[PDB]
Amino acid sequence: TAPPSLKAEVPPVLRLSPLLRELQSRAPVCKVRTPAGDEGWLVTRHTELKQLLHDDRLARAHADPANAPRYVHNPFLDLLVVDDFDLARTLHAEMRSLFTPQFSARRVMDLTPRVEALAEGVLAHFVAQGPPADLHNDFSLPFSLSVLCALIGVPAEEQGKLIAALTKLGELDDPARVQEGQDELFGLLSGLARRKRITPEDDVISRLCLKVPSDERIGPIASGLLFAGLDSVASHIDLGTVLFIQHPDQLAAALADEKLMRGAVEEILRSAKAGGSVLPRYATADVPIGDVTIRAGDLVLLDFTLVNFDRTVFDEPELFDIRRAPNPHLTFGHGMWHCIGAPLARVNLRTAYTLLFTRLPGLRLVRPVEELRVLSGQLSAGLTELPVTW
């Protein structure tokens, strides 16, 4: 297969696939065939990813968005792209000025007692019947979701439908099912905005109303935030928990020392996914990078965790070392595109690991890790299940 194809099934969890390892050793920027069947440029190395994150010729913009080369087939992902390059710039700037104040240090610090309290409640439900239990579906997802709902302003009576609607939102190669969850989610969130415009509450939707006069527009905006943080946080709770099970003496040191726990969270972010953490861009003009020229209109695949195994940056990247320092991973991106939820994601993760392992020090897998499976055909795909006992 020339160019190499990315849809090479799914590698085992917590391991860098042979395909991606050879692509990275081959060149910093590689032409590949995407899961959707089109052609794209995979950025494989740390320095080149950083450079492209700071190059204003990469954008969520294309002269013909409907016909542009695709990474995967998903209409919700397609909503990030507009056909006017000036409009793409101003929309991106606007979105960052809307969202950045919601994740200030004061706000995340102030939310933290609430985050810890939500973790405690989810844990009670997770352990209520004793072991074994599914860490993914009965702790990681409900905890990740309850935090996002508390911050965004989704009441309890609607959180039950969210996991379902958000699941069908991420489905690949089924535009009709993505449209269903899109309909259901956009209608739910914009109705909340209509209410909170009249009766403001301490949540993000209420504060978005003060700068976004359209309730309709708050639908996709809020949906973006939820989808950006739900599976991303949940899957890192899952995989970080496995990494800790596999490295008990490092887990013991992280539990005894908060600074070591912060380092451990960073090492889990660096290494848990081990490639495949791709978001797309398009070139709006020719971009020379490494020894190739990305052409205007071309698809560019930014893989934010493949670069965390770049041997020219990380010594022994395949080893889990919570004391790794410095730890310049790019899991949250960089620059003008840097993940706005990163401070919240970090609090969620250290809250989860701290609570889980102090309450359940015997946590272990029910079956060998080789038997875990990632859901297929899913944007932001996580484990089907994570059975644990304690």
Ligand X SMILES: C[C@@H]1[C@H](O)[C@@H](C)/C=C/C=C/CC/C=C/C=C/C=C/C=C/[C@H](O[C@@H]2O[C@H](C)[C@@H](O)[C@H](N)[C@@H]2O)C[C@@H]2O[C@](O)(C[C@@H](O)[C@H](O)CC[C@@H](O)C[C@@H](O)C[C@@H](O)CC(=O)O[C@H]1C)C[C@H](O)[C@H]2C(=O)O
Residues annotated in a binding site for heme b:
60, 92, 96, 281, 339
CB of 272 to ligand HEM, least distance (A): 9
What mask, x for binding ligand HEM by CB under 6 A, covers residues 336 to 375?
-x-xxx--xx------------------------------
CB of 237 to ligand X, least distance (A): 11
Pick 96 or 197: Cβ nearer ligand HEM: 96
Locate the DSSP E strands across the chain: 29-33, 39-43, 58-59, 133-134, 278-283, 287-289, 292-294, 299-303, 364-365, 387-389
Closest CA to 169 of 215, 217, 216, 231: 231
CB of 302 to ligand X, least distance (A): 10
Residue ranges that bind ligand X, judged by CB under 6 A: 72, 76-77, 79-80, 91, 95, 217, 220-221, 224-225, 227-228, 232, 235, 273, 276-279, 339, 379-381
> What angle, rounded to 10 degrees, do the helices at 141-152 and 215-246 form?
150
**Per CB under 6 A, which region of 16-24, 192-200, 232-240, 313-321 contacts ligand HEM?**
232-240
Among ligand X, ligand HEM, none, partner that 381 touches (CB below 5 to 8 angstroms by kind): ligand X
Which tokens sit at 358? 């102090």
**Per CB under 6 A, which region of 71-79, 230-238, 254-262, 380-388 contacts ligand HEM?**
230-238
Rounded to the nearest angstrom, the gap between the alpha carbon of residue 287 and the centroid of all alpha carbons in its chain is 27
Of all residues in the shown chain, the one whose CB is closest to ligand HEM is 341
DSSP character for 295? P
End-to-end CA distance of the chain: 46
Among ligand X, ligand HEM, none, partner that 79 touches (CB below 5 to 8 angstroms by kind): ligand X
243 binding ligand HEM? (CB under 6 A): no
What mask, x for binding ligand HEM by CB under 6 A, covers residues 175 to 214?
----------------------------------------
Pick 85 or 332: Cβ nearer ligand HEM: 332
| Residue 324: strand, helix, or coil | coil
Q: Report d(CA 197, CA 209) in Å as an integer.
A: 6
Q: Is residue 36 within 8 Å of 278, Cβ to Cβ?
A: no
Which tokens sit at 186? 């956009």
Among ligand HEM, ligand X, none, partner that 200 touches (CB below 5 to 8 angstroms by kind): none
Among ligand HEM, ligand X, none, partner that 276 touches (CB below 5 to 8 angstroms by kind): ligand X
| Beta strand 133-134 pairing with 278-283 | unpaired
DSSP character for 56? T
**Per CB under 6 A, which region of 31-39, 67-75, 185-193, 225-233 contacts ligand HEM?**
225-233
Q: Report d(CA 22, CA 106) in Å as an integer.
A: 44
Q: Report d(CA 242, CA 386) in Å as an integer.
A: 9
Can you say which residues are annotated as belonging to the binding site?
A: 60, 92, 96, 281, 339
Of all residues in the shown chain, the one whose CB is closest to ligand X is 224
Sole residue written with tokens 């600074």: 259
